Design a protein around this ligand. Structure first.
Ligand code: SF4
Ligand code: SF4
Ligand code: SF4
Ligand code: SF4
Ligand code: FCO
Ligand code: FCO
Ligand code: F3S
Ligand code: F3S
Ligand SMILES: [Mg+2]
Ligand SMILES: [Mg+2]
Ligand SMILES: [Mg+2]
Ligand SMILES: [Mg+2]
Ligand SMILES: [Mg+2]
Ligand SMILES: [Mg+2]
Ligand SMILES: [Mg+2]
Ligand SMILES: [Mg+2]
Ligand code: NI
Ligand code: NI
Lengths: 268, 551, 550, 267
């Protein structure tokens, strides 16, 4: 049977969003590319290079017009007419706008494409923006995190394939199954928070009892995500807070890459 | 001459353009160009030193962990903090397990399709393929039945007419030399590799809190709470779980990856005679095991003009000779200040003016060591270990050579390692030796906890006035990494990363000397200038990471 | 002479077997369950809704089964139609659990009756691998795999600490495999452990853990279906379940199924002994409608081994099935001895020690309309053949085709009434269960897609009235039934009639012999001190004595 | 040489042994080939009858003072022990004999730890805990029905690796696994705190992953690591996460005593 086509374009990416796929188990990346989808363009894995891989892109955009899912990782730099990311001699923003024209669905994977992320932080040297900002007429599905659990992406794609539409989205176009709730509103250390049982320094007695990390700068109170429930890597028990480090708010615009690690969160 | 461009170079990390002048089917001159910049050095400036690692880790998600570790090491250097030994063990396990994943993925997912023809694999006899590996490997998943399963997956993919990542590959190219059987072996191993690298990253995740992008470091040590008797912390159950994954890596690494390295070399012996990038090599010692940021398990050093016998050992990350030699130039890069800069005095002022063959043509800076071009990465680290007389490295190289000799009747000399295939071999040797690092450091951690030491973190103080400077070295998967932090009035006033792919991929320098990628391509035969597979073969051997090179 | 085998190992629970041997052949046998808990009494006087969590602990090998039977019994009493999504979930759990259960039975519990690990040390790994060409397409039968396995055995033996392998029946005259096939089997024994682990990951993702699932309710299941919900059964979680379902098939089809044929090929005389009964019962299983019916697997009753005139059972409310079942304690350690219908059952302990002619077991003696009946995979396979189920005939035919390739001989249905036929029925079941899993996963995804997320219908339990219910389930070891009487809103009687009760139960009210005891008559015993042949036949029934006695 | 273990089942359902077949660190095959020498275990032993009895006697002699004794199931004392008879003798006698020479003794599961389900209701067989049968011995209790197998395996590993048991609470339960109430480390505590409660399975709140207190969750009165270590090492799998309240199976006087839907006392 024919598999649903996907076109993946990296902009100002660190490749962590692609690398997330290599940790996935349902599907594994090998099952993703051989059984679940046809990955028609992805520069990290493609056999073809240069003129050959450019041909692949053009052929796919034509053959699958109206049918492919476009995925973008990384921010898109608009300063100086787009020259901070040039592929085959052209600004990546141009490649992305072209591919968006024929897309059945468009996904910003990771905080960079979802809201600018680290690459757009602070002084923002390159005038980096989000995918949605470059595609004002399109509905961009945002899957933030730096990088997200890959299944936040894969189950979004699966919903599109299986049921013919995107999953339910919040008012930031994030899938509710993954981003519908604050981490702190579903965190196993909430009892400690409630009791005033707090780690004050890494390695202190409370830290070594698994107490709440609020006073270490945990951003769980202001970050939407599923890190405390879905967690990471499918081994069980693995997310930053469980390992002993506060949430940094990497999912959440205005938190991650803005607030200091040890800066305290606002609690609602 | 004819001029070609390869843009994008695929099956790397990041955005790379390679241009070549070809004279009578031989590359005469090359240009390497990093085509994307973020300004990560500028983004991290004017923050608390403690915050840097979480931001600069995002320089790269392929070599995740590395910039995080280098950043905390740089802050600790500036502040004069001695990291607790348990924190070192944990950092070391993470780096070794990460690098295991990284190297496996590089050999298989990034590089193999330069050497392997999947179309040819469809013509293979799976039984003959299995028979070829008798007395070469003891791997348990080389049966004809395994190979038939794999062959049928390829057949189904090709039959679907949706080749995806395999579409328009270099099938039937004249530089593809493997027999059908060995192509099928390699595809089977490509798929098997994905499970091994997943196991390596489960190690990383259980200490890091996730991967990509670990979240267990601190300026002062780590955030892991060691308590064998604690619920919800790093207890003996969690450590046993880590160990269960550590133990799963060795067989694939030793019986598949190591063997395939020898097999590829055996079929492509001309690639031992090209792809030399430099005559000078640098590596830093790695995996500190004492309470004072030293006593490294792997040695470092500097080799000049390929002379192992007179190399200079580096045994400390505070080595003044190493520190003082490093500079970067932007003469042929898209930055304003062009004279060589020591990184504590570095600037990164963008000055894009488009491509010029004789002017600026890259976002990568040009590093030098006391004014010389240097190759970094697994070839450098292997040669340095051989120069040090490290028996573990000589023995591991000898095992690869023994397989190669069984297949070809020939041996390999050190002279032949200064090559595209020598570079691949160095990476494999590294991956193999890292499995002993993991066992060693897991055992050290269990032992130390047993003696009553549960310390993991030393809280820093950061003077609110004064200007002071630190540097964090790390031997990353692609070579020597350094982060250079200046603190003034309690915040970062300068931050400069000098990254291994910067050394290798950097453009012509202040004296117009050619760096490793560009040098390595001179002499490359190109059968078909429209499909310059030979160029990509050499470039891929360096494991380019352009997010790293440019940041 | 008279021998005792106590304990019988490599079963669940505490079993004693006694045999009279005359002229080197078993002439008479006794089966004895030697441990009782009184689970039926423990659950009495409680709210009907609480029973399942307690009676699930009848057995942790056949975990899930008593939980499911209990909620079905309550739903029967109360006249509750279970939501179809709850059926799909229940079905996936039962099928995945049973896959684990059967694999572990063939390998961890049974193989060391047929397989000599000492002999495996003498094997040539290459020859062993060569033996399976054109027999299996399994990807882990290389000489290199077999050498790795051989080296582990070598190291264990070298250590002088044989542990679970110490004092096994190595070199026994009834051990017939060549060194190579012994090695193949040990390799498969170790590989089986990964496959069963994957089956239980399916169970865990819907059950909340295993052993002992925790997702049932009288009224449906506790799983909250919401594709768009965080922390609940969403599409990500369903994809995870699917990832494990898909990992089971290859081992089952290319290893377990093949090994079954291989053992038969080397032990063909075990197709001619170990017949336990001439009557067989199974219940239909895997309901797929909104009214507790439309089963994917058929059930029925076979009398005097006549498949052509069997009686189909297509409903768990079948009055013919319900009215036939009784249990006797004439030769059991309970007070009331006359046959009792389970809604009127008692379980009053009356231990008076062992007597050959009196009471000698904690297991009751069930009958169906007064007859002794074998239950379990042999029964379920024969019933499916009688029903003309093409899937079952085809799967049996695949096993027979391998056997024929190895021996040049075929297998007839008459040869299935045997120790090896019983093993074959279990294998066939395990194979067909993989299609159950694919079918029910697909059904669940499809139904959720139509907008049905219903999983639970809250019960009401009248505070007056007496209501009787029975929950049937085709468990790994055969037909299971839980019988609940509700009076004044609480459980006034609870009786479990468990498949191992049918098979292991002692002589009955008419002193007729049950399947275990019958199956042993005629067994040749080369060495009365080491009666391997007896244990071979008894293991074929997959004894579970916590189940049998409860 | 590997450390010897003697495993005896009393009034067990076999669920505690079966837990080992879900384990991953170590897997059961690595446990028995690499970590320990399982000198006696009736579920897996090749030997039966007289041969397996010989194995037991040989091991009790050969490894006197050195083996870890493990018991699953309750021990029935009513009517002089006849409710569990192995090789013609009450299991309590087999257990007392084996306890004599044990280096460490572990009650795996709620049945052996405190009597469990087998001792519930009217307690037909006078079932008691392992500690009650061995009053002069220190019994390490690893409750749960069954526990996550690593609660057991990491306890054994601590003994092997560091030469002593892990730290225990005042019920002799290892603190790494049983040191805290489930409710004092439960990810649904925010919902509890906010009054966001499931009222029936399948209702809107249940389908949003809200707190299960009003469905009868016993997390408030049950010590364990179910919310953190969870089960089966797949991630995200424990009863509450699947949608069902904790029943208190770890905890004496809760599991098998209180109704599923009976509300817990909150401290
Ligand atoms: S979101 Fe994070 S992991 Fe993904 S490209 Fe951006 S920096 Fe990298
Ligand atoms: S502050 Fe962080 S660790 Fe504490 S309860 Fe909230 S999310 Fe959890
Ligand atoms: S504790 Fe539970 S699982 Fe273990 S023997 Fe008792 S009833 Fe069975
Ligand atoms: S009552 Fe149960 S579900 Fe609610 S917070 Fe407590 S332990 Fe968690
Ligand atoms: N390895 C790696 Fe990345 C590069 N180059 C770094 O540091
Ligand atoms: N299978 C199983 Fe257990 C038995 N006998 C039940 O029901
Ligand atoms: S830093 Fe990111 S990965 Fe989750 S725990 Fe916080 S949103
Ligand atoms: S019922 Fe038991 S398994 Fe844990 S969630 Fe409650 S203590
Ligand atoms: Mg401008
Ligand atoms: Mg694996
Ligand atoms: Mg060549
Ligand atoms: Mg201490
Ligand atoms: Mg730099
Ligand atoms: Mg597996
Ligand atoms: Mg829904
Ligand atoms: Mg009964
Ligand atoms: Ni990198
Ligand atoms: Ni059972």
């Amino acid at each position: 049977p024919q598999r649903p086509p996907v076109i993946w374009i990296g902009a100002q990416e660190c490749t962590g969003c692609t690398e997330s796929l290599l940790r996935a188990t349902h599907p594994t990346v090998e099952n993703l590319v051989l059984e679940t989808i046809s990955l028609e363009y992805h520069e990290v894995l493609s056999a073809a290079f240069g003129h050959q891989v450019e041909e692949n892109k053009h052929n796919a955009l034509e053959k699958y017009k109206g049918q492919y899912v476009l995925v973008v990782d990384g921010s898109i730099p608009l300063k100086d007419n787009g020259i901070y990311c040039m592929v085959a001699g052209e600004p990546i923003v141009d490649h992305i706008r072209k591919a968006a024209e024929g897309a059945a669905a468009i996904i910003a994977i990771g905080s960079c494409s979802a809201w600018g992320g680290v690459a757009a932080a602070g002084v923002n040297p390159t005038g980096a923006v989000s995918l949605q900002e470059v595609l004002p007429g399109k509905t961009v599905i945002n899957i933030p995190g730096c990088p997200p659990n890959p299944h936040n992406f894969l189950a979004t794609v699966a919903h599109i394939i299986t049921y013919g539409k995107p999953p339910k989205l919040d008012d930031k176009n994030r899938p509710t199954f993954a981003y519908g709730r604050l981490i702190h509103e579903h965190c196993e250390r909430r009892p400690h928070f409630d009791a005033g049982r707090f780690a004050k320094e890494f390695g202190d007695e409370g830290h070594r009892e698994g107490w709440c990390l609020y006073h270490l700068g945990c951003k769980g109170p202001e970050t939407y995500g599923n890190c405390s429930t879905l967690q990471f890597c499918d081994v069980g028990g693995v997310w930053p807070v469980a390992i002993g480090h506060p949430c940094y708010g990497c999912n959440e615009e205005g938190i991650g890459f803005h607030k200091g690690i040890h800066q305290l969160a606002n609690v609602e | 001459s004819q001029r070609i461009t390869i843009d994008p170079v695929t099956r790397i990390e990041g955005h790379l353009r390679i241009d070549c002048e070809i004279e009578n089917g031989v590359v005469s001159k090359a240009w390497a160009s990093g085509t994307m910049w973020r300004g990560m050095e500028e983004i991290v400036k004017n923050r608390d030193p403690r915050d840097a690692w979480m931001i600069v880790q995002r320089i790269c998600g392929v070599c995740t962990t590395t910039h995080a570790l280098s950043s905390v090491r740089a802050a600790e250097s500036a502040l004069n903090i001695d990291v607790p030994v348990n924190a070192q063990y944990i950092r070391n396990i993470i780096l070794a397990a990460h690098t295991t994943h990284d190297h496996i993925v590089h050999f298989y997912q990034l590089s193999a399709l330069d050497w392997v023809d999947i179309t040819s694999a469809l013509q293979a006899d799976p039984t003959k393929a299995s028979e070829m590996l008798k007395g070469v490997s003891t791997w348990h998943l080389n049966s004809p039945e395994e190979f038939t399963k794999v062959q049928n997956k390829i057949k189904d993919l090709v039959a679907s007419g949706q080749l995806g990542i395999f579409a328009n590959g270099y099938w039937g190219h004249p530089a593809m030399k493997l027999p059908p059987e060995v192509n099928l072996i390699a595809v089977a191993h490509y798929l098997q590799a994905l499970e091994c690298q997943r196991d390596a990253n489960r190690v990383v995740a259980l200490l890091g809190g996730k991967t990509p992008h670990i979240q267990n470091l601190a300026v002062g040590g780590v955030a892991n709470p060691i308590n064998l008797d604690g619920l919800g912390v790093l207890n003996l159950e969690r450590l046993m779980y880590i160990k269960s994954f550590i133990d799963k890596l060795s067989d694939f690494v030793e019986q598949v990856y190591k063997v395939d390295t020898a097999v590829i070399a055996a079929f492509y012996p001309e690639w031992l005679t090209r792809g030399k990038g430099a005559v000078n090599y640098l590596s830093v010692p790695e995996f500190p095991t004492d309470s004072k940021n030293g006593s490294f398990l792997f040695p470092g050093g500097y080799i000049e003009n390929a002379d192992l016998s007179s190399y200079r050992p580096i045994t400390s990350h505070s080595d003044e000779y190493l520190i003082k030699g490093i500079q970067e130039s932007a003469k042929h890069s898209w930055y304003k200040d062009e004279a060589p800069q020591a990184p504590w005095e570095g600037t990164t002022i963008p000055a894009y003016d488009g491509w010029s063959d004789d002017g600026k043509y890259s976002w990568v800076k040009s590093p030098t060591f006391y004014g010389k071009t240097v190759e970094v990465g697994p070839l450098a680290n292997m040669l340095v270990k051989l120069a040090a007389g490290r028996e573990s490295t000589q023995n591991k190289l000898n095992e690869i050579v023994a397989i190669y000799q069984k297949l070809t009747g020939n041996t390999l000399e050190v002279a032949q390692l200064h090559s595209t295939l020598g570079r691949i071999i160095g990476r494999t040797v590294h991956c193999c030796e890292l499995q002993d690092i993991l066992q060693n450091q897991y055992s050290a951690l269990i032992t130390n906890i047993g003696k009553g030491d549960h310390t993991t973190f030393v809280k820093p103080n950061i003077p609110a006035t004064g200007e002071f400077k630190g540097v964090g070295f790390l031997e990353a998967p692609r070579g020597m990494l350094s982060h250079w932090m200046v603190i003034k009035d309690g915040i970062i006033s300068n931050y400069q990363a000098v990254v291994p792919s910067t050394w290798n991929s950097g453009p012509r320098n202040f004296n117009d000397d050619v760096g490793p990628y560009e040098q390595s391509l001179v002499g490359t035969p190109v059968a078909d200038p429209n499909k310059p597979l030979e160029v990509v073969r050499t470039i891929h051997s360096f494991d380019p990471c352009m997010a790293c090179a440019v940041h």
